[PDB]
Structures are given as C-alpha cells and as structure tokens.
Amino acid sequence: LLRRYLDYPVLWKILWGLVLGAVFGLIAGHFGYAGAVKTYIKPFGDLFVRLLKMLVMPIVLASLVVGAASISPARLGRVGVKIVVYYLATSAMAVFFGLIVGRLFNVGANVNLGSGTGKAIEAQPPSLVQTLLNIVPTNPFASLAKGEVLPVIFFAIILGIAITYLMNRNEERVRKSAETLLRVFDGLAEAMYLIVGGVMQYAPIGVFALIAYVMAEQGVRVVGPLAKVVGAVYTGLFLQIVITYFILLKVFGIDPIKFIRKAKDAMITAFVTRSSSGTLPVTMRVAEEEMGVDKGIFSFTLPLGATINMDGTALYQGVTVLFVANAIGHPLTLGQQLVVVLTAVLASIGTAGVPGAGAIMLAMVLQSVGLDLTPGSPVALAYAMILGIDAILDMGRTMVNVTGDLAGTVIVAKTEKELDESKWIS
Amino acid sequence: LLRRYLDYPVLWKILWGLVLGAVFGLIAGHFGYAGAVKTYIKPFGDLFVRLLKMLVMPIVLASLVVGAASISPARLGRVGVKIVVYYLATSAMAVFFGLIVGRLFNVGANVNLGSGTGKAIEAQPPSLVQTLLNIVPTNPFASLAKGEVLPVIFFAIILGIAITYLMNRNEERVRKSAETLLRVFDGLAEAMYLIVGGVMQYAPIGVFALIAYVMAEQGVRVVGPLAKVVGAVYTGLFLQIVITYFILLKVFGIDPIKFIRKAKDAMITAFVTRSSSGTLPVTMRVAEEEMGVDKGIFSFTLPLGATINMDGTALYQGVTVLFVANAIGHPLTLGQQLVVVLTAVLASIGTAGVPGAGAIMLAMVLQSVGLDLTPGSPVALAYAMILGIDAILDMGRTMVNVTGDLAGTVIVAKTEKELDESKWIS
Amino acid sequence: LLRRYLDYPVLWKILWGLVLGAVFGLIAGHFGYAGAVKTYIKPFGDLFVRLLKMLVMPIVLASLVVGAASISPARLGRVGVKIVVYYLATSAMAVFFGLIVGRLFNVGANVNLGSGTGKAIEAQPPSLVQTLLNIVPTNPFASLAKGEVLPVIFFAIILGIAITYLMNRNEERVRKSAETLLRVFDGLAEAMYLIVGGVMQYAPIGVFALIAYVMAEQGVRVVGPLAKVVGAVYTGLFLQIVITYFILLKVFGIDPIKFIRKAKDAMITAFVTRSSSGTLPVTMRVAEEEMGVDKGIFSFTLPLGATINMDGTALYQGVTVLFVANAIGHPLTLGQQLVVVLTAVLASIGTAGVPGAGAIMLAMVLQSVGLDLTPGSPVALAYAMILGIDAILDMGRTMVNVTGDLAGTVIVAKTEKELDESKWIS
Ligand SMILES: N[C@@H](CC(=O)O)C(=O)O
Ligand SMILES: N[C@@H](CC(=O)O)C(=O)O
Ligand SMILES: N[C@@H](CC(=O)O)C(=O)O
C-alpha cells in the first residue's frame, strides 16, 4: 500500500520486518535457493549497509562540534571527564565479563583446526603510546577522507571548544562568524538526523534482506560449535547489562527497571538495525522526551558514546579472541588476559558505528595478541567461521552498546542534578 | 592589447581561438616542429584542462544541493522522475543510434591488428546490481576526495532534500541553521559560477593550445582508417540530434528549429571547450534569459543533466566499442549489442564533465564486453589509435551532450507548464 | 602548579622549556638514558608535532580565503605581485647565499662515503613546467585530503577573489550567500587561531620533549663533520638576515634595527617551536599591534608568506645539497648551481609549515640534481646524518622564515603607504 508503509511506526515496523526475515530465510533454506536470495535480495541489505555507512562520518563530525560548542567549557570539561572515565571503566568491565563467560562456557574447544607448532611465542606487542598518539589527526581532511573516526572526533571536539571560546569575544566581526559556523554545523547535524530518519523508515526492507540472507545462507550453520559462541555472547551481554548497568544506576539513584522500561524503544531499534551511529535520532529522542536530560548532557555524550562507548562490541571481541585462541590450541593466561583487556578497549573504541564493523576491527586485536591473519593459517578459517554469525552477534552487541550509552548519559546527568526527576516518579 | 582581450565576447573569442588553432597546428606540421609546440604550448592546454577538472566536483556538489533544496519535495520528485526517465531513455537511444551508424558505416574495417584466437569467450559480465549499489557513497568525504561523481551527486541530492524538509520545521534554532547552510552552499555554487566565467575568459588561449597541439601532432594522423571513425561519430551525433531531439521537442510542442536557434550560443561553447561541467553558467544563462524556464527546473535539471546526461559521450563509446571489436576480428552480435547498450549508459553517466574523460571511461566499457586492457594485447594499440582523435571526437560529443541537456530541461518544463511562452511567439 | 602554568607568559615559557631541555638531554646522555627518554618522553614531542600538523591545511585554506576576500581585487593584484616577486627574489637570494657559505666553509669534505663511478651523468632534469602546472589542483578536495599545500593555496585564493566579486553584486539572494560563506571561513580561521594559541600553551612541554630527545640521542653526534654543517647553516642564516633583510629594509625607509627589535617576540617563538604555520597568531598580532600594518596586508601576505615564503628552509636545502654532493664525490658546478637555485625554490615553496618537513622535501631536490634516494646508495647514509641533526637546523631556518615573512609584509606595506609611521618615531 502506497504511503501506508511509511505510516506504520518505524519501531514496530522494523521489528516486524526482522521477525518476517527469519521465517523467509527458513522457507528459502527449505527451497534450498540460497543463491537466488543471495543474488536477488542481498543487494537490498548491502544497499542498506552502505546507506548506514554514509551517515557515520558527517554525523560524528557535525554533531560532536555542535555538542562541544553548545556547552560552557567548564561544564564541558566536567561532563567530558565524568563520561570518559565511565566509558573506559565499563569497556574494561565488559571485556573482563566477556573473558569470564568465555572461561565459563569454554568456547571453541573441539573444532580441531590444529595450528602447527610454528610462530607462537610472540604474543604481546601492545603499542599503547602509538595508538594513543594516533588520536590527534595529522591532517583532519585526510582523517575524514580515509575514514578514521577517532581523529575526526578529536578534531571536532577541539573545534567545538574553539567555537565556544569565540562566541564570548569582543569584536562583533569575530563573534558573528563563529555564530555562523556553529549554525552551519548545526544545520548539517539536523539534516543528518532527518536523513537518518529516512534511512530508518527504509530500514525494515533492509533488515528483511540482511537477516533473510543471513538465515538462508546459515540456516544450517548454527548447529556446530558456533552454537556455544552465539549462546556465550548473548549470555555475556545479558550479564554485562544486569550486573554493570544495574549496579551503576541503582547506586547513583535511578531505578534500573525504569531505565530499561524507558530505553526499550531504542534498545529494540538498535537490536534490529545492528548499527550504533545509525540510531542517534531515536536514542536522543528517547533520552530527551522519555529519560529527560537537558540538551547540554545528551547533545554531547550520546553523540560521543555512539562512536567510542562500545561495550557490546568490546565483549564480542573479548570472547572471540579467546575462542580463536582456544580453537588452535593456545588458551590465554593472566598476562594475556591483562593485555587483551587493554587492546580490546582501543580496538572497539576506534570502531565506526556501522554494521559489520565489529568483525573488521577483530583483526586489530588478533594481530595484537600474537596471532596472524594470512589466509594460509587456520586462524583464517576461524575468522571466517566467526564472520559467519557476525550478524547474529552484532544484532545483540549493538543493543548493548546503545543501552550502555543511555546508562552513561543518565548517570552523568544524575551526577549533574539536571535530571527530569518528575518522570521517575508516579 | 591590455584589458581588450577580456572585453572581447567570450563566445566569439572562444571560436576565434579554435579557428586559429587549426591554422597554426597546420603551419607547425608544415614546419615539422610538433615537438616544439608540444614542449612549449601544450602546457597551456594542460593547465586549462586541469582548471576544468578543478571545477567539476565543487560545482556538482554545491549546485546539486542548492537545486534540490530550492524545490518543494513533491515538485522535486516529479521533476526528478520526469528527468531521469528522459536521461536514461535518450542515453539508450543514443547508444543504439551509435551502434546503427557503426553497423552501416562499417567502422574499423581493415586495420589488421590481428588478435590471436585466445581469451575471447568471456564477453558479458554486466555487473548491473553492483555498479548501481555503487551510487550510495560509503563515506561522502571519501567519494569527494577520490573523485567519484555519482556518489557525490546522490549525497548532495539527499542533503538538499533534507534541507528543504528542514526549512519547514518549527524549532527556530533549526530553521535558521538550515537557511544558513543552504546560503553557504548557494554562495559556494555562485562563487564557482564566477570562477567558471573567469576560466571561460581564459579559455581561448587554452583552446589555441589544445587544438593546435592536437593538429600539429595529428596533422597527418587523420588520413588512415580513423577518417571513417571521425566521419561516423559526427554523423551519429547529427543523426542523434535531428532524429531524437527533433522528434521529442516537436511532439511536446516546442519547435526544434527555434530550440537550436536559441541554444547555439551554448552549443558552440560546449563544442569548443569540450567540457560539460565547464559550461554550466553559459547553458543556465541561455536557459533562463532565452529559453525561458523558471529556477525550479534549470537550477536542478541542468546542474544534474550536465554531469550524468551524456548522449554524445554515450554514442562515442557505443561506436568505439564496436570499432575495437571489429578491428581485432570479433564483431558484436545482438546479445553483445544489448549488453553494450546497458553498460555504455552506466559508463557514460559516471563520467565527470571534464575534457578527455570519454576515453578514460572507455575502459569500463571495453573491459565490460570481453576485451582486456593490458598493453601487450593489440587492444592497447586500438585504444591508443582512438585516444589519438579523442580530441576531435570530444569536441563534438560535448556539444551534443549540452544540446541534449537543454532539450531535456525544456521538455520537463513543457510538461510542468513553466515555459516563458513569450519568446516562442513573435 | 595548577592553572599557574597557563598564566605564565607563553613566550618566556616556550623559551624556558627549550633552555631546560638542553640541560635535561645532557644529564640523560650522562646517565646513558637515550632509550628511556626515547620510549617515555619522545611521545610528547611526537604528539606536539602531530598537533602542529593538524593546523596546517585548515589554517592555510580558511585564512587564505578570508585574506584574499577582504581585499578589493584592484589592491589585491598589486599586493600579490609585489609580494610574490619579493618572495621569489629573496628565496633565490637565500639559496645563492647558502651556496656561497657552502663554497666558503667546504661542508662535507672528509666523510669518505665514496660513491662508486656508477650512475652520475644524469644530473639536470629540472621539470619546471610540470611542477608549475601542478599548482592548479585537479580536484581541490583531493588536494586537501592528500596534503598538497600549494594547490589548496591557489584554490583558496581564487575562491577568495570569487567571493570578493560576489559581494559586489545586485541580487540580494547572492550577496547574502557570499557574505555568509565568507563569514563561515572567517569563523573557521579564527577558531584555528584560537586552537593554535591553545597549542602554544601546551607547546613548552612539547618543545621540551623534542629537544630533550634530540639532545639525549645526539648528545655526542655533534662532534664529527656535522659541526661544520651546523655552523655553516647558522652563519648562512645570519648572513641572509643581515645582508638581505637589512639592506632591503634600509633601502625602503624602515630602520632594520627597529624591525628586529619589534619582531623578536615572534622570531624567538618561531625559533623555538620550529614551525612556520604554527606561529601565525603570534606573527600576525606582532605585525598588527607592534609593526602597525592594517588588515589589508598582514591578513593575506603573512598567511601566504608563512606557507610559501621560506628563505631559511631554502638556504638549508641549498647547503645540504652541496654537502651531500661533496660527501660522495660530485661537487656542483655553475650549471648545477643555476639548476639547484631553480629547484630549491620550488622545493621549499611546496613545503608545509610543520616541523621536520625541510628534511622531507630535501628528497624532491636531491632527486632533482642527479642524486638518488634508494636505501642502497651511500645517500642513505649521508641523508641519514643530515636528518640526524634536523632539529638544530630547523629551529633556526623556521626563525629566518618568519623573519623574512615579517620583512616582506612590512616592505609591501611601506610601498603601499599603509604602514603605521607612528611606531617608528620616539
Ligand atoms: N554494531 C556495532 C558495529 C559492528 O559491530 O559492526 C556498533 O555498535 O557500532
Ligand atoms: N566532454 C565530455 C567528457 C569527455 O569526453 O571528456 C563531457 O561532456 O563531459
Ligand atoms: N621549518 C620549516 C618546516 C620544516 O622544514 O620542517 C618551516 O618553518 O616551515
């Protein structure tokens, strides 16, 4: 029905598309025409993923500039520290919980890939200082072109601070220019939120392609030892939520039951669309209208958290590294655990908020702890067997990412007295 | 003389330079000093081409944004469909006319390059779905840097739609920011039109370099079987015009004689400067002041048409592919004809409006239908033989491109009743 | 202490850090802690260098636009000619002075690298016309991303001219758009000046880390034949200043003593921070508040001069080429001198204003005059010992670059009557 497709609620409609995609993938696996749906329908999902990749650099740049320029630098610094310490602490806690649930379920135990006794002693080159110096961009236009996210974030936040210093100057010729630049970037961020609204109204037909192709191709590829991985990552994410976010929220004052009951309208959308930087309008309109946090707190943290605060992806990498280490016969140790918790943070933070980017950055952590990536080694086979259920793991780790984003912004607000205390009373 | 060069009319001057360049190239070929003019004068033409390549990406981005944001989304959609269907239909018709004139003039009859009976069976991998999914940019700043055009066009048109949806919003801090971003891109597009006016003022001394070097270097290279090529491409372009544009215009109501009579002041400039995206000010100032269409049409269609709607380049590729195939001993068939008509459209649409870009993109269509591109095969020899008179073919296909752009915008206006009917009556 | 560090004067602090860096580098070389300071402290200097590279493309683009858009093209043309002629003349004079001081000190005479009698005859391929046609960018966004400066300069200056032509228009729809674009770029350039002024608050610890690492690593590497090079480059720079800038300034009317006295507050900062494009706020404020030149000059000539006018770097290259030629047995002659003076100008102009870039662009002048750059030739050893002491030469050539910039803008003002004749009396 023309014009009626758009009229269904983008939340329920996209969930309806996701719950139909599984049925259609199963009926295709019954027909056994996986090639037909890989050639016909899969391009829809790939176009949707390209659409959601188009809106990761401009949004992060413009929105970070606007957020960091709409705050007084004192309040901006306070919120920045109180949000960055939280992001790093919860990222490390998520990686540790991932390692815990890995040791508990013993993922990848009887795959028998059997890597030879060759190059195995080199295990810990953590290049901390270099991957931290790579934050400041050498040339911001380059770091925008090539696609690096964290350098663009740093440059945007320093430009925002510069602008918020400029609008207090004395020359009326230099105030009305910073004002105009800030209004330019604000118009850009708002146009990008409208574009994401459009892409999200399109997203049901894209999810019905992505998940249907994933099913029809892996309709029988979820029976082997990958069952333990997919039942370990979800248990790790649930434990992450109910043991970290609950503790934090309940300690700081907000009731976590209400937190989930209010955030579900964005948790579900992030779950279905499996993309952090593609659900910023929904999470911001559920932080403002429902969670009740003023513009100063949720116009900077949530634009930031949706690109660096990645707890789900961090736990996914933490369990997957241990899986691939257990598959070829090298279980990690205490030192390897304390180096992988250090490198998974810096490998998930630098990840863009686009689908399928949690497996790409898995290279920068497999190459980190000893392992190689050449297609000749069995680690290539394990990497492919992970990239298989990449989709079913992303569709949960993105939800946990967005939930952690909302928990962090709500906690930073509760530590700034700017909450909408009326909502949490009834 | 000082300050007199500029005051001379840019239309007559750009033709005076082209009519002097032929004579000077011929006298140089007489003197046999083609090396002297290739080392001394050619840098002028190369500077001119570099300028006209500088003025292709900013213009397309800014002007597409402004055109797509200065129109209501309903009228924008109507005109967009009515212009895209036209562009595709006329591109396919131009490619078919090129194939016809090729099959009747028998281009590439006896060159005797003699390709072996080797790799020839792989002849039709048309990657339609992938080259159509390559429209949505993965990272628009990247697609701006690397030089891709069609992704920038898509991103600019979606940003224009977002902006024209913003200026109707109620939050006053958003309307006044969308207005500021739109005026930024409008100032950019207008500065670019002024820069193109300056480049056109410079263009006579650049044409007297380009065409003079081409003459002095190919003063005798227009005698062999390339005579049939240059006499088939011009006949194909003339047939294209007088059989497609005449039919369309006379059916829709406008008299085509008057169309050419009013458009010649841009047809000639396109013919000489051999660059679509370098004559946008001239074609827009001949569509507004003379053709008589309001901004809603010549501010979007002509900025779009002069970058994707390329009938001359499409016909040139359609005849050149058949030439190359007939030269080494493999004349195309009905299926190869129906695959080359499909791939020439997508190989000319993605071409930038800069000189000498109709031979560059000839790779994406020679590599498409069977042929290879390695310098070891005779296909490299045929490719160089074409790139020889590439200039004399471009100087016509650009004119046909711009004429088709004007015909299309006039027709889309004639369906929208936006014509200035006063110019027609007399 | 806390916040007292910032309030400490930036010039005296940036000098005190550099004076303490030598002492700490020497006390480290005493303990033999070169590795410790290379692993711990050096990242601070590398972060400072990356910060000063972040602010070289946006500053040059925005500031060149706002400089060449606030000047009427009538005055802008005169100023541009009078400034580019000066820049090229003093660049060639600096290269000649470098060659003179080289021939009188005989740098690199007893290193005994001893390059064999192999490839030596190819010595003068000066590609003047091509490296001059490389000024106009092929795609300005590409020239911004990849990092080429001069194309960005040309594009920014032509956009500035287009904007200052648009502002004098009739349609109120385009005048406002041009003014808004101009104020956007003005806000951007001013935000960048604020960002730089922030970096210079952090610059003392960075220029302490840099010089401390350089000391502790080359604390004994300044005893060999590199002493003659480090004592020839400084004598060349002093000769440059006192024999070109003094004579020009005294000819045109200003007293050079007063010029040095009023410019030392930026000469010292450039000497320390060893970066031209990183001291634009200081040099512009000392040209305005102390030198006394209106926004017609010090807003365009200085943003250009501090990016293209590099006399110190040119003399550094002119002496280093002769050094590496005398080292491996190939002393230059009159023709080699008159080609190296031609190519060092175009190798210094294309050098970005970031630390350690003269050493990089030294490749584009060694490859020009005969020499190669493969790691197999002895040039991989000679070139290595020059780059070894890059700091103690760059920290002087940057000072001379900025001093020449100030001399040039002051002379262009004194030839335009805009000079503040009040400061030069007492
Ligand atoms: N879904 C992840 C990205 C990915 O794993 O592809 C995110 O939150 O950005
Ligand atoms: N002149 C063609 C391009 C080319 O063939 O170089 C155009 O219309 O854009
Ligand atoms: N010192 C030079 C740059 C360099 O050679 O590193 C300048 O002032 O721009």
Helices (H) and strands (E) in chain B, counts: 22, 0
For residue C81, give every residue at least 6 positions away whose Cβ sits within 8 Å of its Cβ, in sequence order, or none. Answer: none
Give me ligand 2 centre to Cα A181, in Å.
36
* C235 three-state secondary structure: helix
3-class secondary structure, B341: helix
φ/ψ (deg, to 5) at B419: -65, 150
How far apart are the C-alpha atoms of A98 and A234, rounded to whole Å?
10
Q: Which residues contact C210 (CB under 8 A, 6 or more apart)?
A: C21, C45, C48, C49, C274, C355, C391
Maximal CA-CA distance, chain C: 73
Q: Which atom of ligand 3 is nearest to C397's Cα?
A: 1
Å between B148 CA and nearest CA of chain C: 11
Chain A: give the shortest CA distance to residue C211, in Å: 19
Give the pair of three-digit tokens for residue A28: 């295709």
Query: Using CB atoms and an 8 Å cut-off, which of residues 28-47 of chain B contact chain C?
Result: 43, 46-47
Count CA within 13 A, CB hemisphere, residue A388. 21
* Distance in angstroms (rounded) separating the CA atoms of residues A254 and A246: 9
In this structure, are residues C101 and C239 in contact, taking their beta carbons and an 8 Å threshold?
yes
Q: What are phi and psi of C338, to 5 degrees?
A: -80, -5
Q: In this structure, are residues C302 and C280 in contact, taking their beta carbons and an 8 Å threshold? A: yes
| Per-residue CA distances from C163 to A286, B283, C179, C202, C300 (Å) | 43, 22, 8, 36, 15
Across A29-50, b (16+ Cβ under 10 Å) vs e yields: beeeebeebeeebbbbbbbbbb
C347 touches C374 (CB < 8 A): no
CA distance C27 to C31: 7
To test the pocket of ligand 3, the residue of C53, C309, C351 to mutate (highest count of ligand atoms within 8 Å of its CB) is C351
From the list C53, C187, C195, the residue facing A178 with the nearest CB is C187
The distance of B148 to chain A (nearest Cα, Å) reads: 13
CA angle C218, C221, C224 (to 5 degrees): 160
Q: Which residues pair with C419 in a beta bridge?
A: C293
Beta partners for residue C145, in sequence order: none
Q: Which residues of A touch B174 (CB under 8 A)?
A: 186-187, 190
**Residue B293 dihedral angles phi and psi, to the nearest 5°:** -125, 140
Residue C339 DSSP SS3: helix
Give CA–CA dist B166/A189, Å, rounded: 11
| Structure tokens that stand for C234 in this block | 């400084």
Q: How many Å apart are CA C165 and CA A123, to the nearest integer?
A: 63
CB B309 within 8 A of CB B244: no
Nearest to C293 by CA among C400, C164, C426, C414: C414
Other CB atoms within 10 Å distance of the CB of residue A19: 13
Q: What backbone torsions phi and psi does residue A40 show, to the nearest 5 degrees? A: -95, -60
Q: Which atom of ligand 2 is nearest to B359's Cα?
A: 5
Tokens read off for B90:
């006329």
Q: Produce one character per residue of C14-49: b if its CB has 16 or more CB atoms within 10 Å, e if not.
A: bbebbeebeebbeebbeeebbeebeeebbbbbbbbb
Question: How is C358-405 classified by DSSP, letter by letter?
Answer: HHHHTHHHHTTTT----TTSTHHHHHHHHHHTHHHHHHHHHHHHHHHH
Asked whether B275 lines ligand 2 (CB < 6 A), one says yes
As a whole number of angstroms, the distance between CA B186 and CA B129 comes to: 34
Q: Do B178 and A184 touch (CB under 8 A)?
A: no
Q: Which residues pair with A419 in a beta bridge?
A: A293
Check if CATH label 1.10.10.10 holds for domain B1-426. Answer: no
Buried b (16+ CB within 10 A) or exposed e, B1-39: eeeeeeeeebbebbbbbbeebeebbeebbeeeebeebee
Amino acid at B210: L
Q: What tokens does A163 get? A: 């602008």
Say how many C-beta atoms besides its own lie within 10 A of residue A418's C-beta: 18
| Single-letter code of the amino acid located at B354 | V
Residue with tokens 């004399």: B392
For chain B, helix, strand, coil in percent to 5 are 75, 0, 25
Distance from C-alpha of B162 to C-alpha of B164, rounded to nearest angstrom: 6
Question: How many angstroms separate the CA atoms of C224 and C231, rounded?
Answer: 12
CA distance C173 to B426: 32
C215 vs C333: CA distance, rounded Å: 36
- Contact (CB<8Å) C136/B54: yes
Amino acid at the residue C8: Y
Rounded CA gap, B233 and B319, in Å? Answer: 7
| Reported structure resolution in angstroms | 3.4
| Cα distances (angstroms) measured from residue A85 to each of A173, C188, C400 | 38, 31, 45
Quick one: tokens of C68?
Answer: 């060449």
**Tokens standing for B44?**
């002028």
CB A143 within 8 A of CB A151: yes
3-state SS, chain A, equals: CCCCCCCCCHHHHHHHHHHHHHHHHHHHHHHCCHHHHHHCCHHHHHHHHHHHHHCCHHHHHHHHHHHHHCCCHHHHHHHHHHHHHHHHHHHHHHHHHHHHHHHHHCCCCCCCCCCCCCCCCCCCCCCHHHHHHCCCCCCHHHHHHCCCCHHHHHHHHHHHHHHHHHCCCCCHHHHHHHHHHHHHHHHHHHHHHHHHHHHHHHHHHHHHHHHHHHHHHHCCCCCCCHHHHHHHHHHHHHHHHHHHHHHHHHHHCCCHHHHHHHHHHHHHHHHHHCCCCCCHHHHHHHHHHHHCECHHHHCCHHHHHCCCCCHHHHHHHHHHHHHHHHHCCCCCCHHHHHHHHHHHHHHHHCCCCCCCHHHHCCHHHHCCCCCCCCCCCHHHHHHHHHHHHHHHHHHHHHHHHHHHHHHHHHHHHHCCCCECCCCCCC
Structure tokens at C311: 């006399």
Tell me how the structure was determined: cryo-EM
Burial of C384 (0-12, 13-18, 19+ CB in 10 A): exposed
Residue C371 CA to residue C382 CA, distance in Å, equals: 12
**Chain A within 8 Å of C361 (Cβ-Cβ)?**
no
Q: Are B48 and B203 in contact (CB under 8 A)?
A: yes
Q: Are C273 and C311 in contact (CB under 8 A)?
A: no
Structure tokens at A383: 């990497």
Question: What is the spatial distance between Cα A297 and Cα A321, in angstroms, rounded to a whole number?
Answer: 35
Tell me the sheet residues that pair with B293: B419
Quote the Cα angle for A180-A184-A186, to 5°: 115
CB-side neighbour CA atoms (13 Å) of B249: 21
Q: How far is B159 from B143, CA to CA, in rounded Å?
A: 15
CB proximity list for B264: less than 8 A, separation 6 or greater: none
CB B323 within 8 A of CB B229: yes
The partner residues of B419 in beta bridges, in order of sequence, read B293
Count of beta carbons in the 10 Å neighbourhood of residue C335: 10
Nearest residue of chain C to residue A157 (CA atoms): C195
CA distance C176 to C189: 20
Buried b / exposed e across B66-103, counting CB within 10 Å, b at 16+? bbbbbbebeebeebbebbbebbeebbbbbbbbbbebbe
Residue of B nearest to C157 (CA): B195
C-beta B313 within 6 A of ligand 2: yes
State the SS3 of B48-104.
HHHHHHHCCHHHHHHHHHHHHHCCCHHHHHHHHHHHHHHHHHHHHHHHHHHHHHHHH
